[PDB]
Design a protein around this ligand. Structure first.
Ligand SMILES: CCCCCCCCCO
Ligand SMILES: CCCCCCCCCO
Ligand SMILES: CCCCCCCCCO
Ligand SMILES: CCCCCCCCCO
Ligand SMILES: CCCCCCCCCO
Ligand SMILES: CCCCCCCCCO
Ligand SMILES: CCCCCCCCCO
Ligand SMILES: CCCCCCCCCO
Ligand SMILES: CCCCCCCCCO
Ligand SMILES: CCCCCCCCCO
Ligand SMILES: CCCCCCCCCO
Ligand code: NA
Ligand code: NA
Ligand code: NA
Ligand code: NA
Ligand code: NA
Ligand code: NA
Ligand code: NA
Ligand code: NA
Ligand code: NA
Ligand code: NA
Ligand code: NA
Lengths: 89, 89, 89, 89, 89, 89, 89, 89, 89, 89, 89
């Protein structure tokens, strides 16, 4: 095998892998949406607690965001800092 | 392998990868719909809090939108700013 | 590889990619249905709040529609404004 | 590659893509069913609001139907107005 | 490529595409079951509203059935009125 | 290509397609289970309404069964009345 | 193609198809579990209605079992009464 | 094709098929967990009905277990009583 | 085909099959977490029923664990007691 | 086939298999998050039961963690103690 | 097979495997979002228990984070400490 062929299938597999990793984004979208719903329900019934409601929503949502970020990082490594091309040959 | 062949499989893999990434869009759809439902339930029962209900719904939904945007960005990079073609040869 | 072969696998991959992106449509379907259910429950309870109920339902649903639209746009780019065929050769 | 071979894999890919896009139909099925359940619960407890209940159910369901329609349109384009065969050669 | 080979892979891809489209049937199954459950709960508590309960259940369920039908139609087109075989050659 | 080869890949694709279509069976299982749960909860509270509860459960479940039947029909067509083998040659 | 090769790929495809069909088993598992939960909750509050609770649970669960059985039947046909081997040559 | 090659792909497909069938195990896991949760909630509130609660939980869970068992049986047939190897020739 | 080639694809397929079977682990994770949540809610309200709450949680969870174990067993058979290698030639 | 080729496809299949097994991680994430939500709701309402709430949350979550661990173990066996390479030849 | 070819398919398989493992991220996103929702609802109703609410939310979420981390670790091993390349030859 020549080097152009080797890079070609390793990068092609990286494109597939990166796209697949992003499927994780489903999670934070569902979970954070739920938290948003509860915040909406709570500010209506407790206008006074708006400060706590929104800061608590944002903290909890930030935690729920993390695996979305992990997948994004894995995809950006595969696209822009690919660790396989350097191991070839 | 010649350069046309190399670009061909790297770009083909990119098309698949980009479409696969967009599957993440399921998430924000579900979550934001839920938040919308709670907003509807809350403005009915408390017309007096319409301002807070809608601003809270939009803030929380915007957070839930983020992984949908990440996947969109990954797909648009693969289609219009593909980082693999330049690494070839 | 000749140019006809190159276009053939890039476009074939684009057909698969476009179909795959549309899977995101599951999300808005679920979420918006939920918002619709809450709107139904609310207009039964408070017929006078019908204006706010329906305008709030539509606003929240529109937000939940966005990732469905993103996938539609990605699929239409792949079918009718394909960015790969021009990069070939 | 000859033209018959090129059309063959582009169309075969289109058949797979079209079937895959239809997976989105899961969404509206779930969401609209939920809305239906809420309408059933509401007309039982408020026979008087039947008109508003059913018109609100239909409006909200119609919105939830849209990504099902998008996938149907993408599938019908791939089967009956295929945009790839004309780009070949 | 000869015509028998071309028809063979286009039809094989159509078989896969048709089966894949039918995955959408999950949706109406879930949603309509939910509507059924609410109808059961409502006739028990409101025997007097049985007429409205059942007519409303059927209307709402019919709407939720549609994407199941779309997928069935796409599958039957691929099996019995295949649009690709005629484009070959 | 000879005729035995053509039948072989068309039928193999049909086996995969048929199995894939049956995935829809998830739907009715979930939805009808829910309706069953509501029927159980309702006969316990209101033993008198047992007739209406069970007839309403069966009607609603039957509707939810339909996409499971559609998939079964598509799979049985592919196995026992395959429409592709006759189109070959 | 010789007959041994033809049987080999048709049966291999059948093995994959049969395993894939069994994925439907997810559905009845979820739905029937739910019905079981409601039966547990109901016999605790209303020990008297135990007879109706359990007979209603079993009836509704049996209905929810059906698509599980359909997939099982499709898989057993593919394994023990395979309809493709006889169509070959 | 020689007999060793034929057995090789039929068995390889069987390994994939068996693994795929086990995906059904998701279902009973979800459903039975739900039933367990309801049993916990019920014995806390009704220590007196512990006998009925646990016997009802086990009966209902057993029913929900069945499609998990079906998939297990299909996988064990493919691994230890494979019906395809004997049909080869 | 030589024996090394035959073992290679049968074992490779076994690796894929074993990984696929483990997907079932999703189920017990969801269901048992639910039971855990109900146990938490119940010991808070009813500290005196702690004994029954925890023993009931563990029994019900153990049942929900079973399909997780089945998949583990299938995966360990494929890795450490593979039944296909011995059937080859 | 030479030994390098045999190890190559067996290990490549192992990488795919290991990645696939990790999909089970979805389950514990969902379930344990639910248990966490109930613990939060319970300590707010019953600060005095904090000890029991947290110990019960951890016990129940640990049980829900198990299939996540099983998949991790299968993946680490495939990566670091691969049982297939030794069976080759 | 030469060493460049062996490394190429083992690494390509590793890219796919790593992306697939990240699909687990869905789980913690859903579950932690739910816990966040409950924390929002609880601080609104009970501002004085803010300390316990947030510390309990973070503890429970951390537990739910673990399988997200496991998948991340498996993906980073495959990308930056790949255990297969060293086993080759
Ligand atoms: C998932 C990896 C895709 C790589 C395909 C390479 C095909 C090259 C054929 O010569
Ligand atoms: C899924 C990755 C698509 C790569 C297609 C490459 C096919 C080239 C065959 O010559
Ligand atoms: C998965 C993307 C489609 C792959 C197209 C390859 C067809 C060309 C085979 O020579
Ligand atoms: C996923 C679309 C399949 C396209 C495969 C075409 C293969 C042609 C074989 O000559
Ligand atoms: C789903 C598409 C199947 C295509 C099978 C092509 C077989 C090529 C054999 O020459
Ligand atoms: C995925 C659909 C089955 C493809 C059957 C192709 C078998 C032909 C190999 O020569
Ligand atoms: C799902 C497709 C299984 C059929 C594989 C055919 C293998 C033949 C290789 O020559
Ligand atoms: C799904 C299992 C298919 C096994 C394909 C065997 C390929 C052998 C190539 O000569
Ligand atoms: C599903 C397991 C794939 C097995 C691939 C065998 C390919 C051997 C190449 O000579
Ligand atoms: C999914 C299993 C990966 C097997 C890849 C083996 C490729 C060998 C072709 O030269
Ligand atoms: C998913 C693993 C992809 C297989 C990489 C090897 C195929 C390209 C070399 O022919
Ligand atoms: Na997180
Ligand atoms: Na987000
Ligand atoms: Na959106
Ligand atoms: Na919509
Ligand atoms: Na519809
Ligand atoms: Na139906
Ligand atoms: Na059924
Ligand atoms: Na069952
Ligand atoms: Na079980
Ligand atoms: Na467990
Ligand atoms: Na965890």
């Amino acid at each position: 095998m020549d080097m152009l062929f080797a890079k070609t299938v390793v990068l092609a597999a990286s494109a597939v892998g990166a796209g697949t990793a992003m499927i994780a984004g489903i999670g934070p979208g569902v979970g954070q949406g739920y938290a948003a719903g509860k915040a909406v329900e709570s500010v209506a019934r407790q206008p006074e607690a708006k400060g706590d409601i929104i800061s608590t929503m944002v903290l909890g949502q930030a935690v729920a965001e993390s695996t979305g970020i992990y997948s994004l990082v894995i995809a950006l490594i595969l696209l822009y800092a690919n660790p396989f091309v350097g191991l070839l040959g």
